[PDB]
Amino acid sequence: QRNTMSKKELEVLSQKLRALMPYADSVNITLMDDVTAAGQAEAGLKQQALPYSRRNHKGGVTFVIQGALDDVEILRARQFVDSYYRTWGGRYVQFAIELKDDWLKGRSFQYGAEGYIKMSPGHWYFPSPL
Amino acid sequence: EDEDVTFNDISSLSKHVDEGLDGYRDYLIKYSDRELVQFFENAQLKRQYGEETETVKRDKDEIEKPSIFALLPAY
């Protein structure tokens, strides 16, 4: 999708790569589908039962895996990620893995459009829409 | 003793009597230890309104005319 090149241009590109790699006899250019890439990523996370969120941009997809994770989850995650990366590279899909504690450190709050935090009984904080 | 007309009705009388004692509350407060005054005040709030009522920790304080029964043993 993202490349609009003519066959002649592709041939020229091929020849220049061949000039950069003096040990290679020829370079074969193959066109792949982005939807396929993104799909295999998301299906792999579901196949591993990991919790995640997905975000889409003009030119990339970010899967954010964050929170309190078990040792088993961390192991499975790092194994899968290392496998996928070796196949597609880090140029289109990114994985962000972050350990988080409790979101608000264990204190009561209202999460509406007018949410707020109870610092202590008798103490309101109103920092931001939660 | 002051003979000038000053009160008319129950709320004005109770305020007139209360106002007459501030000359002595100011004395007790000026020599009592702030920490003890705070202890005896909090421990009365937790009797009346229940111990779950927020412990005040008035660490920077204007102690809001504390009750004399709480103020006297601190002195």
Curated annotation (Swiss-Prot), chain A:
UniProt-recorded name of the protein: Protein PrgH
Source domain of life: Bacteria
Subcellular location per the Swiss-Prot or TrEMBL entry: Cell membrane
Its biological purpose: Required for invasion of epithelial cells.
Curated annotation (Swiss-Prot), chain B:
Purpose of the protein: Involved in a secretory pathway responsible for the surface presentation of determinants needed for the entry of Salmonella species into mammalian cells.
Residue range from the parent sequence: 76 to 150 of 224
Signal sequence coordinates: none
Gene that this polypeptide is encoded by: spaP
Protein name: Surface presentation of antigens protein SpaP
Compartment list: Cell membrane
Family: Belongs to the FliP/MopC/SpaP family.
